[model samples]
Target: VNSFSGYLKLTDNVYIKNADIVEEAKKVKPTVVVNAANVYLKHGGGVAGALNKATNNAMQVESDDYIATNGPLKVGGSCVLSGHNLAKHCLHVVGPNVNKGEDIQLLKSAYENFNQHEVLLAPLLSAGIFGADPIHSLRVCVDTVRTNVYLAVFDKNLYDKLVSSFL
Candidate 1:
């Protein structure tokens, strides 16, 4: 389930859902684990810009790093795109919102395994199809994961920059 929600704070190394970290860790039985913090959900209704304002709150927590899209980093030169921060390197990917053959290949080529030390982050609900319900959104997010491509939901403004940064 590749669902997007607001940014959450973990006391130590923990799961996003706050399920017992040790128990969940044991259940998954994986040799390695990756923890991503400060994920702001652009969808759920809380406060439109409240999450964006609270990022600094997470920064105070002791951790290796923080990650976000367009928050600290200026978008297209000056327009704050809502998700960017400085804890470590920020990777911006801009593709398309629909999966096409070429886009799929591009995403596959750009794919890389995330480092255990790195905290992946993003803001949800920015440009997603507005009318779709949560279930539909979840489906799309899940399908994107299954295909390992995000041609859909690709941010155009930062597309080229993100590609250049990674490639």
Candidate 2:
């Protein structure tokens, strides 16, 4: 079941729809799901932590492999990992805190890495622990994601604010 939802046209081929992140994710049944993660791929807290339980820590295992073979993942960079318990595939992205103009670009990059899917599930990008307000980040998201996008937003105030801002 979905909760408070709305859709808006931000750009041609790019749009934003807000709904319960989990329920909307189920509806899309995306082949690739995007996990808003940190540099170490630590699933210890925030969205990363929650998806940790959801994906059975398979994500962290892959993240461990990546870090071991490579090094610390930098902000704005993303890696593809086996979804294990959550998705057929996963795009784990290291997001930046809202600072300067590129905060939106960082998210745009994440979507750029995986935009071919007909349906994709994503969260409120860097709006959480990274520190962007939900409404502001969703707007940046609507601007950046260059394709039809369904975003699961758990907070009602954000959704309400988003609608109000659009009008």
Candidate 3:
């Protein structure tokens, strides 16, 4: 529940606030909704799980199709689907092994590869069980990802000068 938020620009437009990703999915009505998935696309947890639940098996089905031809999605690899539930397009990004401390780079590449578009929605890559710091991850994502990043605020209210670079 984003109380109040404004748009800011770094590598691209970023919306900082407290809100549910599902509601944002419909409000922003992004052409693409990005997901951090495993090589098998079996991301039955974290933000990925939220996307999976909302889109049904579209995430796995489409990811399965892509991986079938493209090989296992390495960390930083990505796939897409059309008309998956709330979004017109869904971008499934293969994330890094959270066990690795250097996961920020993997997430950077994954976010960087996002195609330019009018609108796109994304959750923080690995800030939970994956244990990446939210700020550090945000830095990399905003520095590379070239679409509107609608970050859902979790935990307590987190406000940063960079995020408040509201434009």
| Model 1 regions more than 4 Å off | 1-48, 56-131, 146-167
Candidate 3 residue-wise lDDT, 55-84, digit = tens: 776766776777688787677877666647
User: Clash number for every model?
Assistant: 10, 1, 2
RMSD of 1: 14.4
The TM-score values for the models, in the order shown, are 0.25, 0.76, 0.76
- How far is 80's C-alpha from truth in model 1 (Å)? 11
Spell out the clash pairs found in candidate 3. 1-18, 2-18
**lDDT string, candidate 1, 1-167, tens digits:** 33223213222221123232223222433232212121322312222233223445342232222224224311111111223243233233322223122232222212222222133333222123322232233223333332222121223443333233321
Q: What lDDT, from 0 to 1, does candidate 3 have?
A: 0.65
* lDDT for each residue of candidate 2 in 102-153, tens digit (9 for 90 to 100): 4555666655644655555677777867776676666666656665555665
lDDT of candidates 1 onward, in order? 0.27, 0.65, 0.65
Tell me the spans in candidate 3 whose CA falls farther than 4 Å from its real position.
1-12, 100-103, 156-167
